[PDB]
Design an enzyme around this catalytic site. Sequence first.
Site, PDB file in Angstrom:
ATOM      1  N   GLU B  58       0.854  -1.191   0.000  1.00 18.50           N
ATOM      2  CA  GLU B  58       0.000   0.000   0.000  1.00 18.50           C
ATOM      3  C   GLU B  58       0.889   1.240   0.000  1.00 18.50           C
ATOM      4  OE1 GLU B  58      -1.989   1.322   3.747  1.00 18.50           O
ATOM      5  OE2 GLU B  58      -3.745   1.673   2.482  1.00 18.50           O
ATOM      6  N   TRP B  80      -8.374  -2.304  -0.125  1.00 20.00           N
ATOM      7  CA  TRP B  80      -9.089  -1.214  -0.785  1.00 20.00           C
ATOM      8  C   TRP B  80     -10.011  -1.691  -1.900  1.00 20.00           C
ATOM      9  CZ3 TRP B  80      -9.549   3.134   1.572  1.00 20.00           C
ATOM     10  CH2 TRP B  80      -8.497   3.666   2.344  1.00 20.00           C
ATOM     11  N   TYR B  94      -4.992   9.544  -1.554  1.00 26.13           N
ATOM     12  CA  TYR B  94      -3.614   9.662  -1.081  1.00 26.13           C
ATOM     13  C   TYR B  94      -2.533   9.791  -2.145  1.00 26.13           C
ATOM     14  CZ  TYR B  94      -5.842   7.928   3.237  1.00 26.13           C
ATOM     15  OH  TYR B  94      -6.658   7.685   4.320  1.00 26.13           O
ATOM     16  N   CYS B 146      -8.070   9.509   5.762  1.00 23.21           N
ATOM     17  CA  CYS B 146      -8.155   9.300   7.207  1.00 23.21           C
ATOM     18  C   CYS B 146      -6.851   9.855   7.780  1.00 23.21           C
ATOM     19  CB  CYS B 146      -8.297   7.815   7.550  1.00 23.21           C
ATOM     20  SG  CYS B 146      -9.988   7.164   7.344  1.00 23.21           S
ATOM     21  N   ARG B 166      -7.559  12.228  11.295  1.00 22.57           N
ATOM     22  CA  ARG B 166      -8.863  12.777  11.663  1.00 22.57           C
ATOM     23  C   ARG B 166      -9.866  11.705  12.061  1.00 22.57           C
ATOM     24  NH1 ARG B 166     -13.043  11.172   8.505  1.00 22.57           N
ATOM     25  NH2 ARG B 166     -12.268  10.306   6.521  1.00 22.57           N
ATOM     26  N   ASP B 169     -10.083   3.891  13.131  1.00 25.64           N
ATOM     27  CA  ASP B 169     -10.700   2.628  13.524  1.00 25.64           C
ATOM     28  C   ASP B 169      -9.606   1.970  14.383  1.00 25.64           C
ATOM     29  OD1 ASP B 169     -11.232  -0.160  13.639  1.00 25.64           O
ATOM     30  OD2 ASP B 169     -12.266  -0.064  11.682  1.00 25.64           O
TER      31      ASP B 169
HETATM   32  C1  LIG Z   1      -9.899   5.324   7.387  1.00 20.69           C
HETATM   33  C2  LIG Z   1      -8.655   4.852   6.603  1.00 20.69           C
HETATM   34  C3  LIG Z   1      -7.451   4.555   7.500  1.00 20.69           C
HETATM   35  O1  LIG Z   1      -6.344   4.311   7.005  1.00 20.69           O
HETATM   36  N1  LIG Z   1      -7.598   4.553   8.874  1.00 20.69           N
HETATM   37  C4  LIG Z   1      -8.798   4.436   9.517  1.00 20.69           C
HETATM   38  O2  LIG Z   1      -8.883   4.115  10.702  1.00 20.69           O
HETATM   39  N2  LIG Z   1      -9.913   4.700   8.742  1.00 20.69           N
HETATM   40  C5  LIG Z   1     -11.242   4.384   9.255  1.00 20.69           C
HETATM   41  C6  LIG Z   1     -11.805   5.552  10.067  1.00 20.69           C
HETATM   42  C7  LIG Z   1     -13.292   5.233  10.031  1.00 20.69           C
HETATM   43  O3  LIG Z   1     -13.461   4.056  10.861  1.00 20.69           O
HETATM   44  C8  LIG Z   1     -13.600   4.863   8.568  1.00 20.69           C
HETATM   45  C9  LIG Z   1     -13.745   6.117   7.701  1.00 20.69           C
HETATM   46  O4  LIG Z   1     -15.049   6.709   7.987  1.00 20.69           O
HETATM   47  P1  LIG Z   1     -15.258   8.262   7.873  1.00 20.69           P
HETATM   48  O5  LIG Z   1     -14.796   8.766   6.571  1.00 20.69           O
HETATM   49  O6  LIG Z   1     -14.466   8.767   9.025  1.00 20.69           O
HETATM   50  O7  LIG Z   1     -16.683   8.620   8.068  1.00 20.69           O
HETATM   51  O8  LIG Z   1     -12.319   4.167   8.215  1.00 20.69           O
END
Ligand SMILES: *c1cc(=O)[nH]c(=O)n1[C@H]1C[C@H](O)[C@@H](COP(=O)(O)O)O1
Lengths: 264, 264
Positions: B58, B80, B94, B146, B166, B169
């Site tokens: 990635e 993805w 990204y 994210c 921002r 998970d």
């Molecule tokens: C987004 C991608 C990443 O690399 N890291 C993460 O934790 N996420 C998660 C956050 C959230 O659980 C979901 C995105 O939802 P939203 O756009 O915040 O509403 O993926």
Amino acid sequence: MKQYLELMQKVLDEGTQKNDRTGTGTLSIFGHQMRFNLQDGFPLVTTKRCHLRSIIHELLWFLQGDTNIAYLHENNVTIWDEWADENGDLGPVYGKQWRAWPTPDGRHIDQITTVLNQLKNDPDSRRIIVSAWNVGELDKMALAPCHAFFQFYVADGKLSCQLYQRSCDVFLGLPFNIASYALLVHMMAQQCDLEVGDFVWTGGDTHLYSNHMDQTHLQLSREPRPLPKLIIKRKPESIFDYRFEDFEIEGYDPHPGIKAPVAI
Amino acid sequence: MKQYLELMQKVLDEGTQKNDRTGTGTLSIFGHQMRFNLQDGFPLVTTKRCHLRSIIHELLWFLQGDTNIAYLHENNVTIWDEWADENGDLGPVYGKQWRAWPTPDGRHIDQITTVLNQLKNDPDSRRIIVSAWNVGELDKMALAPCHAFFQFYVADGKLSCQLYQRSCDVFLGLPFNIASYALLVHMMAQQCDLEVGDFVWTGGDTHLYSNHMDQTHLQLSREPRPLPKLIIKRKPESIFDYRFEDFEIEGYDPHPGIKAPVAI
Ligand SMILES: *c1cc(=O)[nH]c(=O)n1[C@H]1C[C@H](O)[C@@H](COP(=O)(O)O)O1
Ligand SMILES: *c1cc(=O)[nH]c(=O)n1[C@H]1C[C@H](O)[C@@H](COP(=O)(O)O)O1
């Protein structure tokens, strides 16, 4: 403030020496975070007097989407004189990106109004963001944004906000920046009928300039006073209708002010 | 790792119940910061085995400025897929923003090359930043970034990096994200004859999904085990031409993996 003073002492205790753009020399730490529960009181430093007039006028200035210091001059604020050009312009800084971020396909995005709509119809969104960091227009700016990115959050009807400041002049800048955002939060909250929550400050290159070391120890020898209270005497039609007089700070009794050079 | 498990515990103890866009529901907190001294080894979680080929491909996928999941398939990476269109595109996410931020006047900006050059000619800079939060193209993205904003910092010959996430998970993404950047920092350090420093992670809406409770509890009752060690077999002539083979983690003895559903 306790958090403030504790940060200062942190720079002095773990800071490393670094040269910088202004050739002034600094003491720097990288990465830090502190929280301010806005209900405990308005976060305006008391270990030294701060100039409210400047802080408030700068914010209304940002919110109007202005990037020329004329407005600031009309209200006796000179904090941005050093970087303005012959015509008073600073380039597409804060105000412009906040209200009119220019997209590639000829559009303009009003990030401030977008956020308001989001807080009213989708407050659980994890995307309520405002960014001043427009890579495309960075070279037309008199100074790259310091408080560059911020996010809002809602929980239990309380409005919180985190700011990521990539560069921070701890002695001179931080005091203004903290009050400025704490103020925005109250304004956002009042417009969305929410209560104020936390203001979370996160810093990147956090520093103290070499010619600020004495002043810093002076202030750091004082005892923080009780935090003042913010009273908003009115509720305008929109986030853009606030005026200087709608605001009123109560109980502000700070130690004496301390002067220091502004690294240009 | 301790930091990770503590944050995980924090979410359960202080988390707030929220209804997110997926409709699954989460337990979340706002504002948190973790620090990882890379001298102590790669911060790859051990209380659960992590698929490392997907974390590496990635990252390398990003560096090439690729937004299509074709490349990821070529190497059996399916993180993805639930977001790519019929053609496999994800939008200018990204990779696109890192390698070619589109300006309002046709030109393109390579933030990675820019950073590489700042690190070699102006390491004291307080503007060594790469942003993926291009307001002008958020609607054209399958998913808003994210991990959206990161800054590099140099001191005493050590290269540090702070990431602003921002949305996080905690159970599925946080482990991958952490290692992903820690990895980048090592790549950046090698191309700039600098030693690795600290990796500072800062989060906005940090959450734990309702249907991860069991998996979380299972992980919290396991003991952390010595961090591994990242080994970079060769040294490419640029940060862009690295390869999966070039990396090798040593001393990774994790607890068995834990299966859990992903929120779409
Ligand atoms: C987004 C991608 C990443 O690399 N890291 C993460 O934790 N996420 C998660 C956050 C959230 O659980 C979901 C995105 O939802 P939203 O756009 O915040 O509403 O993926
Ligand atoms: C910039 C603007 C602000 O509101 N507050 C700040 O602290 N600053 C400071 C940061 C730094 O000391 C200087 C900007 O310099 P550089 O762009 O980081 O090189 O002003």
